[PDB]
Design an enzyme around this catalytic site. Structure first.
Site, PDB file in Angstrom:
ATOM      1  N   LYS A 338       0.620  -0.679  -0.217  1.00  0.00           N
ATOM      2  CA  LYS A 338      -0.322  -0.127  -0.389  1.00  0.00           C
ATOM      3  C   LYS A 338       1.255   1.119  -0.179  1.00  0.00           C
ATOM      4  CE  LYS A 338      -1.563  -1.937   3.656  1.00  0.00           C
ATOM      5  NZ  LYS A 338      -0.745  -3.760   3.717  1.00  0.00           N
ATOM      6  N   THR A 339       1.926   1.154   0.713  1.00  0.00           N
ATOM      7  CA  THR A 339       2.451   2.326   0.923  1.00  0.00           C
ATOM      8  C   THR A 339       3.980   3.080  -0.283  1.00  0.00           C
ATOM      9  OG1 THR A 339       3.245   1.848   3.191  1.00  0.00           O
ATOM     10  CG2 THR A 339       4.674   3.871   1.978  1.00  0.00           C
ATOM     11  N   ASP A 392       1.044   7.023   7.708  1.00  0.00           N
ATOM     12  CA  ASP A 392       1.948   5.611   6.630  1.00  0.00           C
ATOM     13  C   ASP A 392       1.189   4.980   7.443  1.00  0.00           C
ATOM     14  OD1 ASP A 392       3.717   4.112   5.486  1.00  0.00           O
ATOM     15  OD2 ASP A 392       5.651   4.462   6.372  1.00  0.00           O
ATOM     16  N   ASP A 393       1.561   4.746   8.835  1.00  0.00           N
ATOM     17  CA  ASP A 393      -0.301   3.241   9.009  1.00  0.00           C
ATOM     18  C   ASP A 393      -0.230   4.211  10.137  1.00  0.00           C
ATOM     19  OD1 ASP A 393       1.046   1.671   7.313  1.00  0.00           O
ATOM     20  OD2 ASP A 393       2.437   0.050   9.636  1.00  0.00           O
ATOM     21  N   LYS A 420     -10.638  17.316  10.297  1.00  0.00           N
ATOM     22  CA  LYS A 420     -11.365  18.274  10.145  1.00  0.00           C
ATOM     23  C   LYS A 420     -11.377  19.867   9.745  1.00  0.00           C
ATOM     24  CE  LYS A 420     -14.986  16.389  13.131  1.00  0.00           C
ATOM     25  NZ  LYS A 420     -14.734  14.821  13.433  1.00  0.00           N
ATOM     26  N   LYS A 497       5.402  -8.543  -2.334  1.00  0.00           N
ATOM     27  CA  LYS A 497       6.266  -8.333  -1.208  1.00  0.00           C
ATOM     28  C   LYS A 497       6.524  -9.827  -1.154  1.00  0.00           C
ATOM     29  CE  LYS A 497       8.704  -5.747   2.557  1.00  0.00           C
ATOM     30  NZ  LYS A 497       7.639  -4.611   4.297  1.00  0.00           N
TER      31      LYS A 497
HETATM   32  N1  LIG Z   1       1.894  -3.601  -8.270  1.00  0.00           N
HETATM   33  C1  LIG Z   1       2.976  -2.999  -7.298  1.00  0.00           C
HETATM   34  N2  LIG Z   1       2.518  -2.466  -5.818  1.00  0.00           N
HETATM   35  C2  LIG Z   1       3.299  -2.257  -4.693  1.00  0.00           C
HETATM   36  N3  LIG Z   1       4.426  -2.621  -4.431  1.00  0.00           N
HETATM   37  C3  LIG Z   1       5.078  -2.795  -5.838  1.00  0.00           C
HETATM   38  C4  LIG Z   1       4.588  -3.213  -6.824  1.00  0.00           C
HETATM   39  N4  LIG Z   1       5.364  -3.828  -7.815  1.00  0.00           N
HETATM   40  C5  LIG Z   1       6.358  -3.815  -7.171  1.00  0.00           C
HETATM   41  N5  LIG Z   1       6.409  -3.504  -5.505  1.00  0.00           N
HETATM   42  C6  LIG Z   1       7.336  -3.250  -4.938  1.00  0.00           C
HETATM   43  O1  LIG Z   1       7.112  -4.291  -3.636  1.00  0.00           O
HETATM   44  C7  LIG Z   1       7.073  -3.174  -2.370  1.00  0.00           C
HETATM   45  C8  LIG Z   1       6.057  -2.450  -1.353  1.00  0.00           C
HETATM   46  O2  LIG Z   1       6.225  -3.103  -0.204  1.00  0.00           O
HETATM   47  P1  LIG Z   1       5.297  -2.234   0.785  1.00  0.00           P
HETATM   48  O3  LIG Z   1       6.680  -1.432   1.321  1.00  0.00           O
HETATM   49  O4  LIG Z   1       4.759  -1.405  -0.028  1.00  0.00           O
HETATM   50  O5  LIG Z   1       4.468  -3.140   1.586  1.00  0.00           O
HETATM   51  P2  LIG Z   1       3.562  -2.618   2.129  1.00  0.00           P
HETATM   52  O6  LIG Z   1       2.081  -2.849   2.416  1.00  0.00           O
HETATM   53  O7  LIG Z   1       3.290  -1.024   2.791  1.00  0.00           O
HETATM   54  O8  LIG Z   1       3.541  -3.925   3.725  1.00  0.00           O
HETATM   55  P3  LIG Z   1       3.503  -4.213   4.966  1.00  0.00           P
HETATM   56  O9  LIG Z   1       1.811  -3.684   5.233  1.00  0.00           O
HETATM   57  O10 LIG Z   1       3.647  -5.751   6.043  1.00  0.00           O
HETATM   58  O11 LIG Z   1       4.567  -3.267   6.094  1.00  0.00           O
HETATM   59  C9  LIG Z   1       8.181  -1.868  -2.468  1.00  0.00           C
HETATM   60  O12 LIG Z   1       9.683  -2.909  -3.125  1.00  0.00           O
HETATM   61  C10 LIG Z   1       7.798  -2.239  -4.064  1.00  0.00           C
HETATM   62  O13 LIG Z   1       9.372  -1.865  -4.899  1.00  0.00           O
END
Ligand SMILES: Nc1ncnc2c1ncn2[C@@H]1O[C@H](COP(=O)(O)OP(=O)(O)OP(=O)(O)O)[C@@H](O)[C@H]1O
Ligand SMILES: Nc1ncnc2c1ncn2[C@@H]1O[C@H](COP(=O)(O)OP(=O)(O)O)[C@@H](O)[C@H]1O
Lengths: 529, 209
Positions: A338-339, A392-393, A420, A497
């Site tokens: 998501k991030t 972020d979270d 708001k 991931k």
């Molecule tokens: N289509 C895509 N969408 C998201 N991330 C992608 C995609 N393609 C490659 N990636 C890679 O996947 C990783 C995304 O991991 P990320 O830090 O966003 O996880 P997260 O969902 O925030 O994790 P968690 O919820 O466990 O904290 C990054 O390395 C990003 O480069």
């Protein structure tokens, strides 16, 4: 004489004219009519704004304009001393010359100027309740007594500078004391043009600048720079030009006149712009590389859908008048990435001010410190004509743990209030949250404050996984066919991931036994929601 | 002269427009001294700071021949959250004491409240202090929705007819602020598909009263 530009300040057109009209109109008019009217002189003014926008310079210039004596610069934090009756003594030393000279010369004395810097660190609201008096309840009393007391001083002027105009006492701002307020903000295009002219006049005069340098271009390029940033840019450009000249002279035996011809500077400006100056109220390019590390690979339609929705939200927040504040929430299963998509949307926003608030920088912080940090981030965001902020979270800022449940209430209240509050008139904002547990948020009643929600799914078909492997490009043709035959069934459930981690772990075996390990790891994982 | 202190509570569903109406009443009051005590200027404060701020506002309110004070979004002041429950006791006690304290002799005062959770306040034994309550409703019929759309002045005549033909067949339940937000969200599409998206969003948001 006003000539705001000649004095060395550009972009201050109205914040100078209003000052001159209101405060200094009774110092220059013929004394006879002033005495006939019988009006006293203003006793001070207040200046507040973002740091590094040219306040102290204006104070010194005002002092020099009126043929006043040397100002007595004072720093707020430096007056405090730990013994009894030392801070008051310091506060009471600044008003000696004025008293002595008035007592001696009668009503023909000069003008004395006192500049207080960071006036909000000694003068805070006094505690009314009995037994709840503050630790600095005497400094304020001494200052109030000195500024306007039983014995009148009619030959003084106090200028106070600060950044937090709402913590200062309310008995220090009545029409008798410090009765004029002004705001110095970030300059717009014309101010940057004027400042660049002021700071390159000397180079233009000495005939060192090239014929291909255009000041308007660099004015447009810098979007949320303050004066200090522009001056630093100019100095850095000239320094790198000198370095290039020396390098050219040493590398080759070329004639010195050729080197002097190269002394003109064109590329130095862009090089320094892109590699030397880091604005505080501007976009930062060093963080996206630390969040979207492996890039965005299009493995299916959901990515396109999410990006399109984000683009629509941005286009809405840019061109609306009935909604200056907009919020959105990205939610989905863990390890869906998501991030990365949030950061990608923010980067594609093309907004002057972009910032990211994540808990990685608040390790060990108590709840109040986190509150203060969030408040500061939003306060900074409120100073630009456009903005975008990412949380972020929203589940680690709260310290949520299923046992209990247990969390921190104060941070949650800060969040609920800050979703708001609209920005000052004419300015716009956008907030993107990212969470993994939407049901608990719904329990806390936070999901009703947002405006819209977006869903980020996982891989759920075999062909999608095969296309993802194709894009990543790790395995060869024969292994590709083997895997495709094995998992042609469309009953997969995996995060991107986790897929990267599994590939990395499986790659560590010998060439013969590589597919089997990957298949075993994939099978060991879950296979349905 | 026998009732120098008055109170009133404005309550209703969320996204209904309570603060605006309270501010309008206060503005139309024509009193020399008017004030608002909102929770968005106390971000990060602890309990005692909030108590001191409220006391300071009321102390100033006690020095004029007339007054009017607005306390809005009470449930944010109390720091309420359903899990638990949890909230602040000091602030609640201060407010309950201040809601029935008379000003010095000869002076008068008026307090207006606002809230969105009436039941939770009822459980705390608070509605024994407020003299009366007023109810602000949502939009509850197609005719009112069309009237609001007209007064806002966004859609043309043909679009008005097209939306009316389908929306006049039943009843609706939607707040005003949410209506503005829905209209703004709908207006970002191409000119062809605006009404379709508006209807889709309205259908999705619609819920049983
Ligand atoms: N289509 C895509 N969408 C998201 N991330 C992608 C995609 N393609 C490659 N990636 C890679 O996947 C990783 C995304 O991991 P990320 O830090 O966003 O996880 P997260 O969902 O925030 O994790 P968690 O919820 O466990 O904290 C990054 O390395 C990003 O480069
Ligand atoms: N309006 C302006 N025009 C030109 N230069 C400016 C302007 N404002 C600030 N500067 C530059 O910023 C430098 C430092 O400003 P400073 O007095 O430190 O501001 P602050 O009061 O915020 O600390 C000055 O040396 C000056 O060159």
């Amino acid at each position: 004489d006003w000539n705001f530009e000649k004095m060395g300040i550009g972009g201050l057109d109205k914040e100078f004219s209003d000052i001159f009209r209101r405060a200094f109109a009774s110092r220059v008019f013929p004394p006879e009519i002033v005495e006939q009217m019988g009006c006293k002189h203003v006793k001070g003014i207040l200046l507040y704004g973002p740091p590094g926008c040219g306040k102290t310079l204006l104070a010194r210039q005002i002092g020099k304009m009126l043929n006043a004596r040397e100002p007595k610069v004072v720093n707020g934090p430096e007056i405090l001393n730990k013994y009894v009756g030392e801070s008051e003594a310091n506060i009471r030393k600044l008003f000696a010359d004025a008293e002595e000279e008035q007592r001696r010369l009668g009503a023909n004395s000069g003008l004395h100027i006192i500049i207080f810097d960071e006036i909000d660190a000694i003068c805070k609201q006094r505690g009314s309740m009995a037994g709840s008096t503050g630790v600095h309840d005497t400094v304020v009393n001494q200052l109030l007594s000195k500024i306007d007391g039983v014995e009148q001083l009619n030959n003084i002027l106090v200028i106070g500078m600060t950044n937090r105009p709402d913590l200062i006492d309310e008995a220090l701002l009545r029409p008798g004391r410090l009765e004029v307020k002004m705001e110095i903000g970030l300059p717009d295009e014309k101010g940057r043009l004027q400042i660049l002219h002021i700071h390159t006049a000397r180079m233009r005069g000495h005939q060192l600048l090239s014929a291909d340098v255009d000041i308007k271009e660099l004015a447009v390029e810098t979007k949320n720079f303050s004066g200090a940033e522009l001056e630093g840019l100019v100095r850095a450009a000239q320094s790198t030009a000198m370095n290039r000249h020396i390098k050219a002279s040493t590398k080759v035996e070329v004639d010195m006149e050729k080197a002097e011809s190269l002394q003109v500077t064109r590329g130095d400006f862009l090089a320094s712009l892109e590699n030397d100056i880091k604005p505080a109220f501007g976009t930062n390019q060093e963080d996206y590389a630390s969040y979207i590390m492996n890039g965005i690979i299009k493995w299916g339609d959901p990515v396109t859908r999410v990006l399109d929705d984000g683009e629509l939200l941005v286009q809405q927040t840019k061109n609306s008048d009935r909604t200056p504040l907009v919020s959105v929430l990205l939610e989905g299963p863990p390890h869906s990435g998501k991030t990365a998509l949030a950061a990608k949307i923010a980067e594609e926003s093309n907004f002057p001010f972009i910032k990211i608030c994540s808990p990685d920088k608040m390790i060990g912080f108590s709840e109040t410190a986190k509150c203060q940090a969030m408040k500061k981030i939003f306060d900074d965001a409120y100073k630009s004509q456009l903005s975008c902020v990412v949380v972020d979270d929203i589940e680690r800022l709260l310290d949520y743990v299923p046992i209990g449940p247990r969390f921190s209430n104060l941070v949650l209240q800060a969040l609920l209030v800050l979703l708001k509050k609209a920005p000052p008139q004419g300015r716009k904002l956008l907030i993107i949250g990212t969470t993994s547990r939407k049901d608990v948020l719904q329990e806390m009643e936070m999901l009703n404050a947002f405006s819209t929600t977006i869903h980020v799914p996982n891989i759920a078909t075999g062909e999608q996984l095969l296309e993802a492997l194709e894009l990543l490009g790790n395995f060869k043709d024969k292994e590709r066919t083997t895997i495709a035959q094995q998992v042609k069934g469309k009953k997969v459930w995996i995060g991107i991931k986790k897929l990267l981690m599994l590939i990395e772990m499986s790659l560590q075996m010998d060439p013969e036994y590589r597919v089997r390990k990957f298949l075993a790891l994939l099978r060991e994982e879950g296979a349905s929601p």
